[PDB]
Design an enzyme around this catalytic site. Structure first.
Site, PDB file in Angstrom:
ATOM      1  N   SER A  47       0.792  -1.220   0.000  1.00 59.12           N
ATOM      2  CA  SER A  47       0.000   0.000   0.000  1.00 59.12           C
ATOM      3  C   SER A  47       0.830   1.278   0.000  1.00 59.12           C
ATOM      4  O   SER A  47       0.242   2.364  -0.100  1.00 59.12           O
ATOM      5  CB  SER A  47      -0.959   0.047   1.185  1.00 59.12           C
ATOM      6  N   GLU A 145      -4.339  -7.276  -6.524  1.00 57.21           N
ATOM      7  CA  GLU A 145      -3.347  -8.132  -7.159  1.00 57.21           C
ATOM      8  C   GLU A 145      -1.913  -7.657  -6.962  1.00 57.21           C
ATOM      9  O   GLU A 145      -0.992  -8.485  -6.968  1.00 57.21           O
ATOM     10  CB  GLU A 145      -3.650  -8.230  -8.660  1.00 57.21           C
TER      11      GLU A 145
HETATM   12  B1  LIG Z   1      -2.032  -2.032   1.992  1.00 59.42           B
HETATM   13  O1  LIG Z   1      -0.751  -2.654   2.236  1.00 59.42           O
HETATM   14  O2  LIG Z   1      -2.481  -1.407   3.320  1.00 59.42           O
HETATM   15  C1  LIG Z   1      -3.642  -2.021   3.851  1.00 59.42           C
HETATM   16  C2  LIG Z   1      -3.222  -2.753   5.081  1.00 59.42           C
HETATM   17  N1  LIG Z   1      -2.841  -3.289   6.052  1.00 59.42           N
HETATM   18  C3  LIG Z   1      -4.004  -3.106   2.882  1.00 59.42           C
HETATM   19  C4  LIG Z   1      -5.050  -4.013   3.022  1.00 59.42           C
HETATM   20  C5  LIG Z   1      -5.237  -4.982   2.064  1.00 59.42           C
HETATM   21  C6  LIG Z   1      -4.402  -5.049   0.981  1.00 59.42           C
HETATM   22  C7  LIG Z   1      -3.380  -4.152   0.841  1.00 59.42           C
HETATM   23  C8  LIG Z   1      -3.141  -3.153   1.788  1.00 59.42           C
END
Ligand SMILES: *[B@@-]1(O)O[C@H](C#N)c2ccccc21
Length: 270
Positions: A47, A145
């Site tokens: 994320s 993905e």
């Molecule tokens: B991303 O890494 O930040 C959220 C958290 N923890 C999340 C949730 C689901 C998928 C990716 C991401």
């Protein structure tokens, strides 16, 4: 080189105890001194790309004065897992600015995919990063993905160094105009997901903004931050992890510990 790793720190022991690999880049923006460990290796963004996504939206808003206020309505099919803000506004819509804040501060996945579409997808975000001089960053896929974090797969990765360099350009440098720069900073400062990562190494009386990433597999998680110690120039840093086995767990404590070592290596008293 002369100002890189003036003081050695035990990153190798830290990553060995973790059971994987840790990558760290930290820059003292006053002197230019750096701490660097596996800093040019690729790690999955997870994320953490959402911070750069919001910056790209802000850059576009410099030419589109109505963009941030634009109301976006979306269907239930847009609400993928971990969309804690956008799920509350499904029946109303949210503005572009609100989606950007949710993507940054709650890691909202539906918000991130909606904003990615606005920019022309993963290649459009990649193009924004190229436009600020980042030749390392690549986004290739959408949520969820992009979190596969497969060992050796360069898709949806960057390096700790390039992350830090781009973060510095966007929060402290001239890549964004001044109002948009401060908005990006304010969104990072209001992040809610990072209290156990870089922030845990930063004294409570210093200002800080960050964006986390957590892929959920391969011990892969990360954080990047700008930190304003009182009385000296800001520090920009990035801490990324990965591990060899799909079911290896990530560790927030390892990220905080690596951030502590980076600040110690820079001689920043905490
Ligand atoms: B991303 O890494 O930040 C959220 C958290 N923890 C999340 C949730 C689901 C998928 C990716 C991401």
């Amino acid at each position: 080189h002369m100002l890189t790793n003036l003081v050695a720190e035990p990153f190798a022991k830290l990553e060995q105890d973790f059971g994987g690999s840790i990558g760290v880049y930290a820059m003292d923006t006053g002197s230019g001194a750096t701490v660097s460990y596996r800093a040019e290796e690729r790690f999955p963004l997870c994320s953490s790309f959402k911070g750069f996504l919001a910056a790209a939206v802000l850059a576009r808003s410099q030419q589109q004065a109505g963009l941030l206020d634009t109301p976006i309505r979306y269907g239930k099919n847009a609400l993928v897992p971990w969309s804690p803000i956008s799920e509350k506004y499904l029946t109303t819509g949210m503005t572009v600015a609100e989606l950007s804040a949710a993507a940054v501060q709650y890691s909202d996945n539906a918000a991130a995919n909606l904003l990615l579409k606005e920019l022309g997808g993963p290649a459009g975000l990649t193009a924004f990063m190229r436009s600020i001089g980042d030749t390392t960053f690549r986004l290739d896929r959408w949520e969820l993905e992009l979190n596969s974090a497969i060992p050796g797969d360069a898709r949806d990765t960057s390096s700790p160094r390039a992350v830090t360099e781009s973060l510095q350009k966007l929060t402290l440098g001239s890549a964004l105009a001044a109002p948009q720069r401060q908005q990006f900073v304010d969104w990072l400062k209001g992040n809610t997901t990072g209290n156990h990562r870089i922030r845990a190494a930063v004294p409570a009386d210093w200002a800080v903004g960050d964006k986390t990433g957590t892929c959920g597999v391969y011990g892969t998680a990360n954080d990047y931050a700008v930190v304003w110690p009182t009385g000296r120039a800001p520090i920009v840093l990035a801490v990324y992890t990965r591990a060899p086995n799909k079911d290896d767990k990530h560790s927030e404590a390892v990220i905080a510990a690596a951030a502590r070592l980076a600040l110690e290596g820079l001689g920043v008293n905490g």
